Paper text:
The Streptococcus pyogenes bacterium secretes the protease IdeS and the glycosidase EndoS, which specifically catalyse cleavage and deglycosylation of human IgG, respectively. We present crystal structures of both enzymes in complex with their IgG1 Fc substrate, which was achieved using Fc engineering to disfavour preferential Fc crystallisation. We show that mutation of IgG Fc residue E382, which consistently forms salt bridge interactions in Fc crystal structures, can be used as a strategy to discourage Fc self-crystallisation and thus promote crystallisation of protein complexes. We present crystal structures of IdeS/IgG1 and EndoS/IgG1 complexes, to a resolution of 2.34 Å and 3.45 Å, respectively, and map the extensive interfaces that are formed in these complexes.
IdeS from Streptococcus pyogenes (strain MGAS15252), containing a C94A mutation to abolish catalytic activity, was combined in a 1:1 molar ratio with our panel of IgG1 Fc variants, and the resulting complexes were purified by size exclusion chromatography. We obtained crystals of IdeS in complex with the FcE382A variant, which crystallised in space group C121. The data for this crystal is twinned, with a refined twin fraction of 0.493 for operator -h,-k,l, as determined using twin refinement in Refmac538. The crystal structure shows asymmetric binding of IdeS across the Cγ2 domains of the Fc and its lower hinge region. The enzyme appears to clamp down over the lower hinge region of one Fc chain, creating a cavity in which the catalytic residues are brought into close proximity with the cleavage site. In complexed IdeS, the loop curls upwards to accommodate the Fc hinge within the active site cavity. The carbonyl oxygen of G236 is hydrogen bonded to the amide nitrogen of the catalytic cysteine (mutated to alanine here) and the side chain of K84, which collectively form the oxyanion hole, as predicted. Binding of the hinge distorts the Fc peptide backbone at G236 in order to promote scissile bond cleavage; this residue is thus identified in Molprobity49 as a Ramachandran outlier. Unsurprisingly, the most extensive interface is formed with the Fc chain being cleaved (annotated as chain A in our structure), with an interface area of 1392 Å2 and a solvation free energy gain upon interface formation of −16.2 kcal/mol, as calculated by PDBePISA35. A secondary interface is formed across the second Fc chain (annotated as chain B in our structure), with an interface area of 804.7 Å2 and a solvation free energy gain of −7.6 kcal/mol.
Numbering used by the authors:
A (entry chain B): 230 to 444
B (entry chain C): 43 to 338, 349
C (entry chain A): 229 to 445
Write the structure that this text describes.
């Protein structure tokens, strides 16, 4: 008798990027990922379902060999913007010869009454002005679900020297986050207007921008 | 009172330590390199916590290198490509480094590589790895599926090389029984005599040994290197000498008593098996041969 | 028939103190030694504790605790001194048991690494937020390493507990930053009440600083 297997292929199934689902210029994709695929049994067959109905547009990524002598095997299904937002369920079914049966995972958008982000821009502290670079802050609160995109711009150009905190659960069950843009103090002192852009389902046109400037 | 009368058997190529202190908890000889034995020692960084199998194999490999030291340098000139494990563009292991660091308990290249590249997600999973299988993967290059725990079947369908190993592939091939250098034996259910007898033969035939044992939990057992054994006039084990990757580097070689415990099981303790000292039951043995029948060819 | 068993290492785990406990002299930090997956057949687990190799006798050892999976867990808890932990002294749990060939040793000490001092800045609510019933007081802590930190709020000497603090985020220069948000009724803020953000961290003098935030200077 063989000893019994102590594990096998795992499937992880990942939603679209928030921004992709909210801009009809972009294409949102659901991604199905299989790890611990053995070299003895490396083929993965993928089948996709939307509200239980089969769809045939998945793209098949080439397998990725890993340092631990397994494969990471991926399938990527592009979805329709409004299907995702209307709360439809995407099901990845994964067949591999190491398992006697398929693994099924399902993803959908978080459920809950959507709620509009409140966006507020907060200038640098007077105390921080002793430094060469200063901190512009955007607080986004009151929003649900947690899928959101935040960016910065100035004067028609994107600003990329920022870091955004992950969403944090607030006491009322909504979410909040902060984003920090770091700029050279000189730029702020000149009177330049920097802008915090937020994309989310519960905003009109899925978008808002709030401005921040010295005056 | 009878005269003391002990037959001591030690691994091919291993000088028994000479100075043995009695410590508060164990009788031990501190590590001195180049005496032929090895003490890979875990740092417990989150990755090596449960990697005693890869450590015991590591120590068996470092011995193997010492035994086969001239044939191995000749092999690496003949096949320079086996001086490195490449993953495309990146370098994962240099066989030259393994050799120059093998003396280091805490920072051998061979354990770093096991911990960091080959088996980094095992401790998180709360499984470990079978020593024999690490060896069959490192030398012959037999693929190691970490979820499959049976001994290597040479006649198996998947015969391709593991990209983590295969260093001595061109002598120790896959598919030939005769080139598999490893064994594994179950000791549950077996007698002091039977176990004593198998350890004597394997040492005497020139194998390196690893010994697994219960570790006072229901779920996960331990494995160590068994470097020498003492037997009585009746030829039963009295004692063994071991290195252990969970033991810090200042301890080195430990003497363990052997003997049947209260509950009728063969067991091992830093102290004498008697009274309430029930020790850890011994569970199985792992074996590595030099492969010199094959090297000669 | 031969049968394998899992081989790995210990069912013994050693845990550091809570970061905030080590940084507030009001609180007591504890190092905790835990043994899991202990059989009902097994004998007693004994603990011995050591600090830079010197034995100490103040550990508090619970009796063994049956679990839903019908194993036992045994815990011992040693209280440590704030400054000992931060000065990088080593705590060693020795676990003795007759069913172990020899005692198991784990040792923990603080990870070392070049400290960096937090810069602490308090930021009032947006003018735009004043149309709401509750407003947001913000404390930005940046520039700090390591990531272990505690932030609290106070007002006129009274603790303020309606806050949430973000996890640390790794900044571009390899330091950390976070924001804390205190939510207060607009009315209380407009009263000119003086709120305070307190930050506890290794790289501050006295391990502590406080910055004030109020409507009118
Ligand atoms: C062999 O190596 C491979 C490669 O691993 C990589 O290299 C090695 C050396 C290590 O350093 C690895 O850490 C490194 O990742 C191993 O493959 C890995 O296997 C593990 C599991 O063993 C997977 O972990 C899962 O990861 C997901 C999150 O995955 C994203 O984020 C990762 C970084 O944060 C990133 O590395 C991944 O690529 C992935 O990135 C995303 O990719 C998508 C698609 O492209 C993209 O759209 C995203 O934008 C991108 N995101 C980012 C951040 O970049 C994590 O969610 C999993 O956690 C769930 O499951 C756990 C069970 O393992 C469970 O404990 C968790 O709690 C959690 O549980 C879930 O919880 C949610 C609620 O939060 C609940 O709703 C769910 O139902 C619940 N589900 C379950 C099942 O419980 C998990 O940690 C790695 O993704 C995977 N790595 C890669 C690169 O694919 C392999 O394991 C190794 N094998 C061996 C034998 O060692
Ligand atoms: C039988 O049941 C036992 C009891 O478990 C508990 O009760 C059962 C019924 C379930 O409800 C459990 O989910 C529950 O935990 C099990 O004991 C556990 O064993 C496992 C390993 O087999 C332990 O996992 C380890 O967790 C470490 C972190 O520990 C913190 O977080 C844990 C959860 O993730 C938590 O349970 C711990 O108590 C601790 O958390 C603090 O607890 C206190 C209360 O005491 C809280 O007030 C605090 O807020 C908590 N947080 C903090 C920070 O204070 C990991 O660090 C560890 O990983 C490390 O080691 C591995 C290798 O060993 C490395 O790979 C890794 O990199 C890292 O170094 C590991 O994941 C678990 O902690 C144990 N539980 C307890 C209570 O101790 C038995 O395992 C189970 N037996 C079987 C056979 O199933
Ligand atoms: Na050791």
């Amino acid at each position: 008798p063989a000893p019994e297997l102590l594990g096998g292929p795992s499937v992880f199934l990942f939603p679209p990027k928030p921004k992709d689902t909210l801009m009809i210029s972009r294409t949102p994709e659901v991604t199905c990922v299989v790890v611990d695929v053995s070299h003895e049994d490396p083929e993965v067959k993928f089948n996709w379902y939307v509200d239980g109905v089969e769809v045939h547009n998945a793209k098949t990524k080439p397998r990725e060999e890993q340092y631990n002598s397994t494969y990471r095997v991926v399938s990527v299904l592009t979805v329709l913007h409004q299907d995702w937002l209307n709360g439809k369920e995407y099901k990845c079914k994964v067949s591999n010869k190491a398992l006697p049966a398929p693994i099924e995972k399902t993803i959908s958008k978080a459920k809950g009454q959507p709620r509009e982000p409140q966006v507020y821009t907060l200038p640098p502290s007077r105390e921080e002005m002793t430094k060469n670079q200063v901190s512009l802050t955007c607080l986004v609160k009151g929003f649900y679900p947690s899928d959101i995109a935040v960016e910065w711009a100035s004067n028609g150009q994107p600003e990329n020297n920022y870091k955004t905190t992950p969403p944090v659960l607030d006491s009322d069950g909504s979410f909040f986050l902060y984003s920090k843009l770091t700029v050279d103090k000189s730029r702020w002192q000149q009177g330049n207007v920097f802008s915090c852009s937020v994309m989310h389902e519960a905003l009109h046109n899925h978008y808002t921008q709030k401005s921040l400037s010295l005056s | 009172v009878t005269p003391y009368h002990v037959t001591s058997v030690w691994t091919k190529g291993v000088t028994p330590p000479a100075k043995f202190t009695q410590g508060e908890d164990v009788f031990h000889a501190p590590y001195v390199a180049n005496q032929g034995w090895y003490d890979i020692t875990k740092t417990f960084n989150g990755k090596d916590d449960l990697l005693a199998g890869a450590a015991t194999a590591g120590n068996m490999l470092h011995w193997w290198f010492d035994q086969n030291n001239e044939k191995i340098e000749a092999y690496l000139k003949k096949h320079p490509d086996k001086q490195k494990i490449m993953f495309g563009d990146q370098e994962l292991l240099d066989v030259r480094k393994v050799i120059n660091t093998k003396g280091d308990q805490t920072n051998s290249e061979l354990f770093n590589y096991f911990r960091d590249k080959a088996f980094p997600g095992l401790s998180a999973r709360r499984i470990g790895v079978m020593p024999d299988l690490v060896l069959d993967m490192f030398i012959n290059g037999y693929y190691l599926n970490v979820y499959k725990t049976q001994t290597t079947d040479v006649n198996r369908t998947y015969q391709e090389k593991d990209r983590r190993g295969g260093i001595f592939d061109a002598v120790f091939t896959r598919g030939d029984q005769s080139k598999l250098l490893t064994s594994r034996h179950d000791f549950k259910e077996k007698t002091l005599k039977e176990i004593s007898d198998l350890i004597k033969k394997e040492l005497t035939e020139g194998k390196a040994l690893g010994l697994s044992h219960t570790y006072a939990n229901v779920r996960i057992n331990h494995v160590i290197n068994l470097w020498g054994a003492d037997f009585d006039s009746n030829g039963n084990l009295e004692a063994i000498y071991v290195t252990d990757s969970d033991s810090n580097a200042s301890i080195g070689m430990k003497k363990y008593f052997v003997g049947v415990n209260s509950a009728g099981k063969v067991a091992i303790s830093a102290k004498e098996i008697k009274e309430d000292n029930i020790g850890a039951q011994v569970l199985g043995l792992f074996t590595l041969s030099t492969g010199q029948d094959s090297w000669n060819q």
